[PDB]
Design a protein around this motif. Structure first.
Motif, PDB file in Angstrom:
ATOM      1  N   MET A 251       0.843  -1.188   0.000  1.00 19.29           N
ATOM      2  CA  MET A 251       0.000   0.000   0.000  1.00 19.29           C
ATOM      3  C   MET A 251       0.876   1.234   0.000  1.00 19.29           C
ATOM      4  SD  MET A 251      -2.731   1.377   2.795  1.00 19.29           S
ATOM      5  CE  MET A 251      -4.053   0.341   2.180  1.00 19.29           C
ATOM      6  N   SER A 252       0.637   2.139  -0.946  1.00 18.87           N
ATOM      7  CA  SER A 252       1.448   3.354  -1.058  1.00 18.87           C
ATOM      8  C   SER A 252       1.268   4.229   0.172  1.00 18.87           C
ATOM      9  CB  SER A 252       1.064   4.147  -2.306  1.00 18.87           C
ATOM     10  OG  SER A 252      -0.270   4.616  -2.209  1.00 18.87           O
ATOM     11  N   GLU A 253       2.265   5.059   0.465  1.00 18.78           N
ATOM     12  CA  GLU A 253       2.216   5.927   1.640  1.00 18.78           C
ATOM     13  C   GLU A 253       1.090   6.929   1.491  1.00 18.78           C
ATOM     14  OE1 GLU A 253       6.028   6.362   3.267  1.00 18.78           O
ATOM     15  OE2 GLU A 253       6.987   6.723   1.313  1.00 18.78           O
ATOM     16  N   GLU A 254       0.868   7.339   0.250  1.00 11.26           N
ATOM     17  CA  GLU A 254      -0.220   8.231  -0.109  1.00 11.26           C
ATOM     18  C   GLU A 254      -1.539   7.622   0.352  1.00 11.26           C
ATOM     19  OE1 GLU A 254      -0.091   8.783  -4.227  1.00 11.26           O
ATOM     20  OE2 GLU A 254      -1.509  10.470  -4.316  1.00 11.26           O
ATOM     21  N   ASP A 255      -1.857   6.447  -0.183  1.00 10.09           N
ATOM     22  CA  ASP A 255      -3.081   5.737   0.180  1.00 10.09           C
ATOM     23  C   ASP A 255      -3.166   5.427   1.662  1.00 10.09           C
ATOM     24  OD1 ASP A 255      -4.140   5.791  -2.284  1.00 10.09           O
ATOM     25  OD2 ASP A 255      -4.158   3.615  -2.599  1.00 10.09           O
TER      26      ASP A 255
ATOM     27  N   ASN B 148      -5.741   8.538   8.525  1.00 14.18           N
ATOM     28  CA  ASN B 148      -6.486   9.717   8.939  1.00 14.18           C
ATOM     29  C   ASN B 148      -7.992   9.462   8.945  1.00 14.18           C
ATOM     30  OD1 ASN B 148      -4.260  11.494   9.457  1.00 14.18           O
ATOM     31  ND2 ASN B 148      -3.962  11.665   7.237  1.00 14.18           N
ATOM     32  N   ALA B 149      -8.413   8.440   8.207  1.00 14.96           N
ATOM     33  CA  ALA B 149      -9.812   8.034   8.174  1.00 14.96           C
ATOM     34  C   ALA B 149     -10.182   7.119   9.347  1.00 14.96           C
ATOM     35  CB  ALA B 149     -10.129   7.342   6.846  1.00 14.96           C
ATOM     36  N   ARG B 150      -9.238   6.891  10.260  1.00 13.59           N
ATOM     37  CA  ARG B 150      -9.443   5.925  11.339  1.00 13.59           C
ATOM     38  C   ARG B 150      -9.002   6.428  12.705  1.00 13.59           C
ATOM     39  NH1 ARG B 150      -8.750   3.218   6.645  1.00 13.59           N
ATOM     40  NH2 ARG B 150      -9.643   1.116   6.442  1.00 13.59           N
ATOM     41  N   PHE B 151      -7.793   6.962  12.785  1.00 13.79           N
ATOM     42  CA  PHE B 151      -7.174   7.146  14.096  1.00 13.79           C
ATOM     43  C   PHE B 151      -7.556   8.371  14.946  1.00 13.79           C
ATOM     44  CE2 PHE B 151      -4.743   3.570  15.280  1.00 13.79           C
ATOM     45  CZ  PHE B 151      -4.483   2.897  14.105  1.00 13.79           C
ATOM     46  N   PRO B 152      -7.824   9.525  14.314  1.00 16.53           N
ATOM     47  CA  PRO B 152      -8.147  10.699  15.138  1.00 16.53           C
ATOM     48  C   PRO B 152      -9.319  10.476  16.105  1.00 16.53           C
ATOM     49  CG  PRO B 152      -7.706  11.368  12.877  1.00 16.53           C
ATOM     50  CD  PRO B 152      -7.719   9.863  12.881  1.00 16.53           C
ATOM     51  N   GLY B 153      -9.067  10.709  17.389  1.00 21.35           N
ATOM     52  CA  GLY B 153     -10.096  10.603  18.403  1.00 21.35           C
ATOM     53  C   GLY B 153     -10.660   9.209  18.556  1.00 21.35           C
ATOM     54  N   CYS B 154      -9.902   8.210  18.117  1.00 20.24           N
ATOM     55  CA  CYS B 154     -10.381   6.833  18.145  1.00 20.24           C
ATOM     56  C   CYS B 154     -10.399   6.239  19.554  1.00 20.24           C
ATOM     57  CB  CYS B 154      -9.559   5.951  17.203  1.00 20.24           C
ATOM     58  SG  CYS B 154      -7.900   5.620  17.770  1.00 20.24           S
ATOM     59  N   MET B 155      -9.666   6.852  20.479  1.00 21.50           N
ATOM     60  CA  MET B 155      -9.637   6.344  21.847  1.00 21.50           C
ATOM     61  C   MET B 155     -10.457   7.144  22.883  1.00 21.50           C
ATOM     62  SD  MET B 155      -5.818   4.846  22.391  1.00 21.50           S
ATOM     63  CE  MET B 155      -4.960   3.834  21.184  1.00 21.50           C
ATOM     64  N   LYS B 156     -11.225   8.136  22.439  1.00 19.43           N
ATOM     65  CA  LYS B 156     -12.121   8.857  23.354  1.00 19.43           C
ATOM     66  C   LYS B 156     -12.992   7.897  24.174  1.00 19.43           C
ATOM     67  CE  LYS B 156     -13.366  12.041  24.789  1.00 19.43           C
ATOM     68  NZ  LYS B 156     -13.059  12.358  26.215  1.00 19.43           N
ATOM     69  N   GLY B 157     -13.029   8.102  25.485  1.00 18.95           N
ATOM     70  CA  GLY B 157     -13.793   7.231  26.362  1.00 18.95           C
ATOM     71  C   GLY B 157     -12.939   6.089  26.882  1.00 18.95           C
ATOM     72  N   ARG B 158     -11.728   5.975  26.350  1.00 21.56           N
ATOM     73  CA  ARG B 158     -10.866   4.857  26.703  1.00 21.56           C
ATOM     74  C   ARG B 158      -9.530   5.300  27.297  1.00 21.56           C
ATOM     75  NH1 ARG B 158     -13.543   0.436  24.631  1.00 21.56           N
ATOM     76  NH2 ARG B 158     -14.913   0.828  22.839  1.00 21.56           N
ATOM     77  N   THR B 159      -8.939   4.408  28.082  1.00 23.48           N
ATOM     78  CA  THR B 159      -7.573   4.565  28.541  1.00 23.48           C
ATOM     79  C   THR B 159      -6.624   3.997  27.499  1.00 23.48           C
ATOM     80  OG1 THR B 159      -7.762   4.553  30.967  1.00 23.48           O
ATOM     81  CG2 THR B 159      -5.821   3.521  29.981  1.00 23.48           C
TER      82      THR B 159
END
Ligand SMILES: CCCCn1c(=O)n(Cc2ccccc2F)c(=O)c2[nH]c(Cc3ccc(NS(=O)(=O)c4cn(C)cn4)cc3)nc21
Ligand SMILES: [Mn+2]
Length: 602
Positions: free
Chosen positions: A108-112, A118-129
């Motif tokens: 998978m290219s770095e671009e892709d 960025n479509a997954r990780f931001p704020g993905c752990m809110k509510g969690r430790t």
């Protein structure tokens, strides 16, 4: 600003490199809390506790400190099709196949991957430790060991990593200011939840992705909480990332068990072995040998890091601290030592639980007392009349290696164990002799490359690393080839084995299991100083020890037919040429050719 989220340990006492990695992703993921893991028993207690309390684990009261986790049925295995490796040049990761799509990796290219992340990780752990797991792959203070840091929002991951690795504060101290692998993981379900929660097991199968960036020394995993997907030190680091490092540094990171075998006279050798799935790999790692006087000890059941020492020995460490074995099929008959290992301090996943608080699974081979009942892994009452299994086929035990009754005295020696033989294996019901020996190192590399195995369908699994190559399989073959040039290399004899050949009636020719010690006996003595054939050396007539066996149909077991091997070599040449293509080392093209020429003369 971030110190105020920390519920254990201290930002200040973290190496600078660690602190920045943590702060960077803490900021991106937004976990309510940060818990720097100290790896202590008390910490483990309070986590099991939290987990019991949140409905995540359930204690198995039949045993000393054993636990059961059940998963979302959509999240039950390592999953190849969401696993990729990210490089600038695709070619560094996989060869460009002549025909269509690569079976040897997933680039998978770095671009892709920028967009994917960025479509997954931001704020993905809110509510969690966010837990911070410092772990060493290999004995603490072994020059062969490498260190990682795993950030995860999964207490299951944390408790499993305590077993499968050396984890805690002592790792931060061995690590100092040095390098480490950066591992990030998130079950992908911020609170409040957007989709329903099954079996209290947070996962996101739609966006599931397990990516490795070898150049940034990072492993980034999203959406799954299971085994090879979440326990990042295991496949991601110890095989995929390690293979790259090993290639840069002149050693080998491989998908091999390691066992020590002693003969009656007390002469000991270490053997390594690579098997595809469905071969009884783990069963062999802990073999209770049937030959009198012989001893088999377990160093590791899955992964081996191998590096030549000053003296020239190919020494190996188990980079792992525990076994993550498949449960179904584990019994006092197929594997007594596994059975004793997991009697305590063990975490189980998707096994059935009996009414008196034990574990259960297909092939366990163990009558239940009168009126003892069973709850399946789907958390439902189960009978043997449902058609369906009580334990998921990929269900697991996660158990300390130190508890294995036959664990090797040096299973944890910082200096490794000298490997004197490398075994490749497969399940071939037809064609392939029980055992044979490579003609040379070069031919050995090719035997590894040519591996195929039954899974109804016969598939290729070169080195049993097909799902795990950290980089171009072609360049990986060249890397193995160059090992022969390492100064003063005491190179291991290379063997190929097959427990699974059948007669014309569909019946196995070899009694296998503990009897495979008769096959190791042959290897052992061959290592110390045969009948030549087109595929390599097989045993001389009467060289195999069959005392106490029935009548074995050796002739058919060790038969090598032109008709078969014509087809075989054609399939192998076609595979390697289509799939490795321009990266196929010429020395391999010669082994193919040579095989073809030896076969055409038979
Ligand atoms: C994926 C599941 C593989 C199961 N299995 C296996 O695991 N081994 C590997 C092995 C297991 C245990 C110790 C060493 C060792 F090398 C083997 O060597 C092995 N060989 C076979 C084919 C075979 C050959 C003979 C029989 N006869 S049997 O009498 O049914 C039998 C069952 N058990 C537990 C012992 N005897 C059943 C199956 N099945 C095997
Ligand atoms: Mn494995």
């Amino acid at each position: 600003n971030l110190s105020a989220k920390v519920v254990q340990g201290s930002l200040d006492s973290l190496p600078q490199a660690v602190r920045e990695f943590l702060e960077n992703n803490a900021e991106l993921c937004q976990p309510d809390h940060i818990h720097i893991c100290d790896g202590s028993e008390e910490e483990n207690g309070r986590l099991l506790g939290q987990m019991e309390e949140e409905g995540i684990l359930r204690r198995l009261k039949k045993y000393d400190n054993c636990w059961l986790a059940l998963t979302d049925p959509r999240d039950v295995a390592r999953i190849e099709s969401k696993t990729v490796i990210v490089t600038q040049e695709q070619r560094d990761t996989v060869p460009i196949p002549k025909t269509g799509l690569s079976q040897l990796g997933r680039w998978m290219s770095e671009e892709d991957f920028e967009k994917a992340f960025n479509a997954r990780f931001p704020g993905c752990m809110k509510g969690r430790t966010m837990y911070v797991i410092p772990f060493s792959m290999g004995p603490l203070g072994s020059p062969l060991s490498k260190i990682g840091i795993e950030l995860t929002d999964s207490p299951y991951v944390v408790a499993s990593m305590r077993i499968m690795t050396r984890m805690g504060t002592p790792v931060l101290e061995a690590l100092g200011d040095g390098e480490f692998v950066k591992c990030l993981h998130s079950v992908g379900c911020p609170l409040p939840l957007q989709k329903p929660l099954v079996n209290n097991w947070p996962c996101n199968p739609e966006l599931t992705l397990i990516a490795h960036l070898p150049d940034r020394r990072e492993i980034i995993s999203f959406g799954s909480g299971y085994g090879g997907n979440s326990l990042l030190g295991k496949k991601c680091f110890a095989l995929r990332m390690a293979s790259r490092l090993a290639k840069e540094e002149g050693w080998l990171a491989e998908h091999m068990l390691v066992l020590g075998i002693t003969n009656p006279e007390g002469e000991k050798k270490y053997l390594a072995a690579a098997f595809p799935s469905a071969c009884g790999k783990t069963n062999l790692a802990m073999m209770n040998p049937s030959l009198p006087g012989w001893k088999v000890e377990c160093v590791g059941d899955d992964i081996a890091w191998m590096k030549f020492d000053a003296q020239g020995h190919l020494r190996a460490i188990n980079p792992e601290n525990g076994f993550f074995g498949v449960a179904p099929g584990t019994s006092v008959k197929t594997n007594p030592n596994a059975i004793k290992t997991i009697q305590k301090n063990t975490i189980f996943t998707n096994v059935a639980e009996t009414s008196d608080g034990g574990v259960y699974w297909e092939g366990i081979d163990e009558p239940l007392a009168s009126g003892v009942t069973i709850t399946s892994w789907k958390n439902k009452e189960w009978s043997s009349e449902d058609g369906e299994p009580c334990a998921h086929p990929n269900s697991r035990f996660c158990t300390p290696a130190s508890q294995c009754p036959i664990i090797d005295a040096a299973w944890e020696s910082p200096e490794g164990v000298p490997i004197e033989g490398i075994i490749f294996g497969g399940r071939r019901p037809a064609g392939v002799p029980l055992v044979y020996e490579a003609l040379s190192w070069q031919h050995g590399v090719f035997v590894g490359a040519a591996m195929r195995s039954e899974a109804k369908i016969i598939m290729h699994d070169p080195f049993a690393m097909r799902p795990f190559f950290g980089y171009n399989f072609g360049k990986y073959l060249a890397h193995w080839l160059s090992m022969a040039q390492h100064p003063a290399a005491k190179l291991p004899k290379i063997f190929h084995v097959n427990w699974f050949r059948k007669d014309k009636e569909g019946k196995f020719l070899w009694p296998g299991f503990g009897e495979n010690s008769r096959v190791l006996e042959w290897m052992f003595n061959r290592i110390d100083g045969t009948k030549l054939t087109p595929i390599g050396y097989i045993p001389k007539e009467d060289a195999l020890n069959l005392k106490g066996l029935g009548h074995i149909n050796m002739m058919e077991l060790f038969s090598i037919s032109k008709e078969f091997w014509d087809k075989e070599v054609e399939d192998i040449e076609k595979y390697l040429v289509d799939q490795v293509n321009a990266d196929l080392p010429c020395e391999i093209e010669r082994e193919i050719l040579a095989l073809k020429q030896r076969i055409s003369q038979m």
